[PDB]
Design a protein around this nucleic acid. Sequence first.
RNA 1: GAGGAAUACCGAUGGCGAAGGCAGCCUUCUGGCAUAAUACUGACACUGAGGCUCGAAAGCGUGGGUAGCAAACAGGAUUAGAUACCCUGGUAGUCCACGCCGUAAACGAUGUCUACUAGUCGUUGGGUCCGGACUUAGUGACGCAGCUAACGCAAUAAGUAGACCGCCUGGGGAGUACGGCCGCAAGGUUAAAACUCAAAUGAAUUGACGGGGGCCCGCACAAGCGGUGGAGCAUGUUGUUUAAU
Lengths: 57, 115, 153
Amino acid sequence: PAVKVKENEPVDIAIRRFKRACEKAGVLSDVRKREFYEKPTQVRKRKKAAAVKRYKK
Amino acid sequence: SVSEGIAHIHASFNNTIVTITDRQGNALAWATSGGQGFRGSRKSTPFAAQVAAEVAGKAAQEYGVKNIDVLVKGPGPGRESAVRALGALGYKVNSISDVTPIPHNGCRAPKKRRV
Amino acid sequence: PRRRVVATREILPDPKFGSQTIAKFINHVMSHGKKSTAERIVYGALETVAQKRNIEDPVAFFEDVLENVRPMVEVKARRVGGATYQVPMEVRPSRRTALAMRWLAEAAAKRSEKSMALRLAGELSDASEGKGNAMKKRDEVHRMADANKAFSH
RNA sequence: GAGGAAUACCGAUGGCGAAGGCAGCCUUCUGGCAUAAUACUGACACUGAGGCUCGAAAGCGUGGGUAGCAAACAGGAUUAGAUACCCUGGUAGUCCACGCCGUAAACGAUGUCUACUAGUCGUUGGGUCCGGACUUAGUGACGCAGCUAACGCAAUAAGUAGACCGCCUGGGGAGUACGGCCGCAAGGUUAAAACUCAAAUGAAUUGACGGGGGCCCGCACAAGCGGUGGAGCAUGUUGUUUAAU
């Protein structure tokens, strides 16, 4: 997640592009998933519920 | 002394630390939200990060840095406000990078809080 | 209320200046529905300050002191998931005028001059330069708003 | 620089395995499965009491290791208390080797094997034809008939039948006692009785309630004005006192 700010462009637009790049790169999601350890049974439950929801919709 | 610099924006959920170093990695200045009068809930806000970045930038600007590239790390809220503070303080940003430590399924995390 | 925004009542202007601002301040000074007593209190205050300062038209002076007393940022309680945050927000102009008038009356109600009209005139004079309990209350409110200055929810 | 553990992304009602389980990458050793055709054996099959094997995690023994996490434990908070939840540390354990243990909501709460019984849409591994079509072995979502107390199941049956095995017979007492057997131990396994109660249960229904969700209203709150609670007095009540109050 690296954004090289070009000439004369505002830091606001530069940080908007950086936020977009960082959201694409999955940075905050990955740092969230390490916040607490999650038991394999709860991971499997969460994934199975996600698959059921994704298939229904 | 130094014209090119790096601004590290280490931002946690509780605090955000804004250090400014040279290209090599030797710290020139730093500021924290907890070292700017804000404590507790106020300290973990984007505004406290804004004032911390303002203080650190204005302290390191006397060194001679005008060109700077930022290194954001952590999930805290001030990770976006500190960069705006640096940009509005007159710093010429070089690049915005997000170098946050991401293990590849390494050390076991602390247990989930039952609140 | 809970559904609609009532149409505000019309306030007829004061008889001796023709200004709804002075009429509303007379209402704020009023008690027990005594328009005559409130009007003579306010008029005594106004003539006292006018004769002391040598000003022909004191409605402009009252506007000046009112805009000087009016705050701009007030602290409002907000709830976000069980946290009571004292978020500073703007003050809508009607509430601005109401707060200014209420603060002026309540500050003039606690002074040491002999008559209430003298008290009100002294308070108007003091807030004209920028002193008095109305000014202290405005400064306190601004102090709290700036003391938070950290919640822009 | 040292070290240990786990292998982000891929990643998927995806895959493999009898189940328990099994995720970086590479080599070595090795099991099963799927598939097309030909050839071969010629009922060699199914199930299976006792028995044997394997069997998560925790735990145990000996010897190593020890980064993170973390029972116990220590301190800090919270609280009426707080041997908790939250915080800061933290040891066994988690890791390895070789053995024990033999238990889990070890679950699909659904024994294994065989045949037959509308259909529709996914996905995995093959195969054959002309991007589709078909056919296979899995793996999912629906949905007839049928079944079911109902929920629901429905070619991966809880349907229609058959073979063999396991098990149940009110709730507690109790998976407890005693006796065997197994185990280093923790314990496991097999498994009663007295006594006690007229219930205990399943599914669904209508309400009510939730420190469940959504939407809405009322001086309910919020924004304000004026009070009550402090004084004296009026009045009512309690208590007390009285012959009665």
